[PDB]
Design an enzyme around this catalytic site. Sequence first.
Site, PDB file in Angstrom:
ATOM      1  N   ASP A   1       5.128   5.405  -4.992  1.00 36.38           N
ATOM      2  CA  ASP A   1       6.117   6.386  -5.373  1.00 36.38           C
ATOM      3  C   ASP A   1       7.499   5.831  -5.724  1.00 36.38           C
ATOM      4  O   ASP A   1       8.360   5.564  -4.903  1.00 36.38           O
ATOM      5  CB  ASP A   1       6.200   7.309  -4.177  1.00 36.38           C
ATOM      6  CG  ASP A   1       7.105   8.509  -4.378  1.00 36.38           C
ATOM      7  OD1 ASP A   1       7.617   8.750  -5.489  1.00 36.38           O
ATOM      8  OD2 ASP A   1       7.285   9.207  -3.375  1.00 36.38           O
ATOM      9  N   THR A   2       7.736   5.763  -7.031  1.00 36.44           N
ATOM     10  CA  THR A   2       9.044   5.268  -7.493  1.00 36.44           C
ATOM     11  C   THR A   2      10.245   6.150  -7.251  1.00 36.44           C
ATOM     12  O   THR A   2      11.394   5.753  -7.356  1.00 36.44           O
ATOM     13  CB  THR A   2       8.980   4.952  -8.972  1.00 36.44           C
ATOM     14  OG1 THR A   2       8.716   6.148  -9.690  1.00 36.44           O
ATOM     15  CG2 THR A   2       7.850   3.986  -9.203  1.00 36.44           C
ATOM     16  N   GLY A   3       9.954   7.394  -6.883  1.00 36.98           N
ATOM     17  CA  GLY A   3      11.046   8.301  -6.511  1.00 36.98           C
ATOM     18  C   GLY A   3      11.474   8.294  -5.041  1.00 36.98           C
ATOM     19  O   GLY A   3      12.487   8.863  -4.665  1.00 36.98           O
TER      20      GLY A   3
HETATM   21  C1  A76 Z   1       9.208  16.818  -6.346  1.00 36.66           C
HETATM   22  C2  A76 Z   1       7.959  17.527  -5.817  1.00 36.66           C
HETATM   23  C3  A76 Z   1       7.355  18.389  -6.940  1.00 36.66           C
HETATM   24  C4  A76 Z   1       6.915  16.555  -5.176  1.00 36.66           C
HETATM   25  N1  A76 Z   1       5.719  17.292  -4.693  1.00 36.66           N
HETATM   26  C5  A76 Z   1       4.492  17.049  -5.161  1.00 36.66           C
HETATM   27  O1  A76 Z   1       4.297  16.320  -6.112  1.00 36.66           O
HETATM   28  N2  A76 Z   1       3.464  17.647  -4.539  1.00 36.66           N
HETATM   29  C6  A76 Z   1       3.650  18.545  -3.396  1.00 36.66           C
HETATM   30  C7  A76 Z   1       2.109  17.303  -4.973  1.00 36.66           C
HETATM   31  C8  A76 Z   1       1.378  16.350  -4.050  1.00 36.66           C
HETATM   32  C9  A76 Z   1       0.503  16.873  -3.106  1.00 36.66           C
HETATM   33  C10 A76 Z   1      -0.244  15.971  -2.358  1.00 36.66           C
HETATM   34  C11 A76 Z   1      -0.098  14.600  -2.582  1.00 36.66           C
HETATM   35  C12 A76 Z   1       0.818  14.183  -3.534  1.00 36.66           C
HETATM   36  N3  A76 Z   1       1.539  15.045  -4.240  1.00 36.66           N
HETATM   37  C13 A76 Z   1       7.518  15.698  -4.030  1.00 36.66           C
HETATM   38  O2  A76 Z   1       8.310  16.156  -3.230  1.00 36.66           O
HETATM   39  N4  A76 Z   1       7.104  14.421  -3.980  1.00 36.66           N
HETATM   40  C14 A76 Z   1       7.497  13.384  -2.978  1.00 36.66           C
HETATM   41  C15 A76 Z   1       6.286  12.843  -2.210  1.00 36.66           C
HETATM   42  C16 A76 Z   1       5.573  13.897  -1.457  1.00 36.66           C
HETATM   43  C17 A76 Z   1       4.372  14.404  -1.944  1.00 36.66           C
HETATM   44  C18 A76 Z   1       3.723  15.402  -1.239  1.00 36.66           C
HETATM   45  C19 A76 Z   1       4.272  15.887  -0.063  1.00 36.66           C
HETATM   46  C20 A76 Z   1       5.468  15.354   0.426  1.00 36.66           C
HETATM   47  C21 A76 Z   1       6.123  14.362  -0.271  1.00 36.66           C
HETATM   48  C22 A76 Z   1       8.119  12.164  -3.623  1.00 36.66           C
HETATM   49  O3  A76 Z   1       7.107  11.631  -4.474  1.00 36.66           O
HETATM   50  C23 A76 Z   1       9.323  12.376  -4.500  1.00 36.66           C
HETATM   51  O4  A76 Z   1       9.667  11.088  -5.018  1.00 36.66           O
HETATM   52  C24 A76 Z   1      10.517  12.958  -3.768  1.00 36.66           C
HETATM   53  C25 A76 Z   1      11.645  13.242  -4.751  1.00 36.66           C
HETATM   54  C26 A76 Z   1      12.921  13.702  -4.079  1.00 36.66           C
HETATM   55  C27 A76 Z   1      13.964  12.786  -3.820  1.00 36.66           C
HETATM   56  C28 A76 Z   1      15.130  13.220  -3.192  1.00 36.66           C
HETATM   57  C29 A76 Z   1      15.268  14.557  -2.815  1.00 36.66           C
HETATM   58  C30 A76 Z   1      14.241  15.469  -3.073  1.00 36.66           C
HETATM   59  C31 A76 Z   1      13.064  15.044  -3.702  1.00 36.66           C
HETATM   60  N5  A76 Z   1      10.995  12.032  -2.744  1.00 36.66           N
HETATM   61  C32 A76 Z   1      11.140  12.316  -1.448  1.00 36.66           C
HETATM   62  O5  A76 Z   1      10.834  13.394  -0.989  1.00 36.66           O
HETATM   63  C33 A76 Z   1      11.660  11.146  -0.572  1.00 36.66           C
HETATM   64  N6  A76 Z   1      13.119  11.177  -0.396  1.00 36.66           N
HETATM   65  C34 A76 Z   1      13.947  10.231  -0.833  1.00 36.66           C
HETATM   66  O6  A76 Z   1      13.554   9.189  -1.342  1.00 36.66           O
HETATM   67  N7  A76 Z   1      15.269  10.480  -0.670  1.00 36.66           N
HETATM   68  C35 A76 Z   1      15.791  11.737  -0.124  1.00 36.66           C
HETATM   69  C36 A76 Z   1      16.230   9.482  -1.163  1.00 36.66           C
HETATM   70  C37 A76 Z   1      16.633   9.752  -2.595  1.00 36.66           C
HETATM   71  C38 A76 Z   1      17.715  10.606  -2.853  1.00 36.66           C
HETATM   72  C39 A76 Z   1      18.055  10.868  -4.179  1.00 36.66           C
HETATM   73  C40 A76 Z   1      17.297  10.276  -5.191  1.00 36.66           C
HETATM   74  C41 A76 Z   1      16.234   9.436  -4.832  1.00 36.66           C
HETATM   75  N8  A76 Z   1      15.907   9.166  -3.559  1.00 36.66           N
HETATM   76  C42 A76 Z   1      10.898  11.087   0.774  1.00 36.66           C
HETATM   77  C43 A76 Z   1       9.404  10.811   0.549  1.00 36.66           C
HETATM   78  C44 A76 Z   1      11.468  10.008   1.689  1.00 36.66           C
END
Ligand code: A76
EC number: 3.4.23.16
Lengths: 99, 99
Positions: free
Chosen positions: B25-27
């Site tokens: 996960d690059t995000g």
């Molecule tokens: C954006 C939405 C649509 C996405 N959801 C989904 O894609 N799904 C629910 C589908 C799914 C289901 C099952 C398996 C896989 N995927 C998501 O939240 N993806 C997360 C990973 C995840 C998947 C499923 C369940 C929980 C979590 C992740 O891939 C994504 O990169 C998010 C993006 C995000 C960043 C900042 C704020 C809000 C969203 N990162 C995160 O949630 C991470 N946070 C961060 O990295 N930060 C808060 C730091 C940050 C801040 C600002 C910018 C970048 N990074 C977590 C994992 C630690």
Amino acid sequence: PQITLWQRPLVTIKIGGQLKEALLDTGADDTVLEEMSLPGRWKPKMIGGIGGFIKVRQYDQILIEICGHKAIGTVLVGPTPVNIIGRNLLTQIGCTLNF
Amino acid sequence: PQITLWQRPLVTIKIGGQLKEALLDTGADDTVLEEMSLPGRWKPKMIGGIGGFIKVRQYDQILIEICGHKAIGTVLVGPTPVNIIGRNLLTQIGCTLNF
Ligand SMILES: CC(C)[C@H](NC(=O)N(C)Cc1ccccn1)C(=O)N[C@@H](Cc1ccccc1)[C@@H](O)[C@H](O)[C@H](Cc1ccccc1)NC(=O)[C@@H](NC(=O)N(C)Cc1ccccn1)C(C)C
């Protein structure tokens, strides 16, 4: 380009004639942008992540340009901390992960 | 390897001689793994995402191996629905985004 991950893979997108920055995100299924007005009808939708579910608006068949590459697809708008480009549009622009 | 984004980029990781699967996960800035009890010292931490924050335990200096590539760093453990490999370990395996 080839993008390394020492920092956040933020790029400039163009959408609705606006310029924004967005995160290229291989872990997101969908594309989620901060609250904005786009032209178009929309459906209310829910999406989840860490922390839970948010309510978003779904816009279909939206044209977006990412680093000069065009994509046309579904965009969700809602109270996201950061604009996220997910796999629905990354596949259209030929994005891969390499190592 | 070149990973395509048609499907979620799930790979096998080894952690502690266990195989698991995880999302590249690059995000994500950080790496977040499903609840497990590792030996080691931990710190409490909160991490945020789409719908809010969860509580996790932070372990430093954990070795993980990702598709035969070793990486060493901080891992957060908690009630995540998916194991997430973040940029802190992706960089170590030389991982890039290409389009
Ligand atoms: C954006 C939405 C649509 C996405 N959801 C989904 O894609 N799904 C629910 C589908 C799914 C289901 C099952 C398996 C896989 N995927 C998501 O939240 N993806 C997360 C990973 C995840 C998947 C499923 C369940 C929980 C979590 C992740 O891939 C994504 O990169 C998010 C993006 C995000 C960043 C900042 C704020 C809000 C969203 N990162 C995160 O949630 C991470 N946070 C961060 O990295 N930060 C808060 C730091 C940050 C801040 C600002 C910018 C970048 N990074 C977590 C994992 C630690």
